[PDB]
Amino acid sequence: KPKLLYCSNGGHFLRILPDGTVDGTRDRSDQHIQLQLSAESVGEVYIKSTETGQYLAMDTDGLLYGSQTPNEECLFLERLEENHYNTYISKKHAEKNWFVGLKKNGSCKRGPRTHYGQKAILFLPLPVSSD
Ligand SMILES: O=S(=O)([O-])c1ccc2c(S(=O)(=O)[O-])cc(S(=O)(=O)[O-])cc2c1
Numbered sequence: 610k611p612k613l614l615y616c617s618n619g620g621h622f623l624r625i626l627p628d629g630t631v632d633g634t635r636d637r638s639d640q641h642i643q644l645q646l647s648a649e650s651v652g653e654v655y656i657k658s659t660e661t662g663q664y665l666a667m668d669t670d671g672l673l674y675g676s677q678t679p680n681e682e683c684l685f686l687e688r689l690e691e692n693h694y695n696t697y698i699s700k701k702h703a704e705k706n707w708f709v710g711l712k713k714n715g716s717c718k719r720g721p722r723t724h725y726g727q728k729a730i731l732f733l734p735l736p737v738s739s740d
Pocket of ligand 1: 618711712723725728731
């Protein structure tokens with residue numbers, strides 16, 4: 610686990626499946642839930658689940674998905690929610706403020722149902738590239 614992400618309240622750990630599906634696990638423990646960001650400019654950053662090559666994106670469906678094409682979709686409107694994490698915003702649908710989080714239960718969302726208000730987006734990165 611040279612790198613992994615964690616949700617504030619959610620207490621889950623985003624995961625990227627090599628099948629082409631995303632989600633969150635109350636506790637990191639899957640084939641590969643590795644994560645990684647690639648900020649390219651304030652209010653616009655990238656994310657690549659370093660492992661298989663899955664870029665954390667959000668299709669028009671508003672459901673976290675992979676995109677082999679890093680452009681106006683894979684990006685993630687990132688700014689600052691608190692003073693540590695990095696609450697992004699589906700740049701593919703920022704007009705709906707479809708943040709990047711996962712129901713504090715164990716199951717991401719899809720479409721209109723991913724807007725901050727508590728602390729289920731506050732993603733705390735805990736990388737440690739040491740292997
Ligand atoms: O930031 S977010 O748009 O990913 C998001 C989404 C859902 C949330 C819910 S939910 O309606 O699924 O029971 C509860 C809470 S709470 O009051 O326990 O901190 C925070 C949430 C944050």
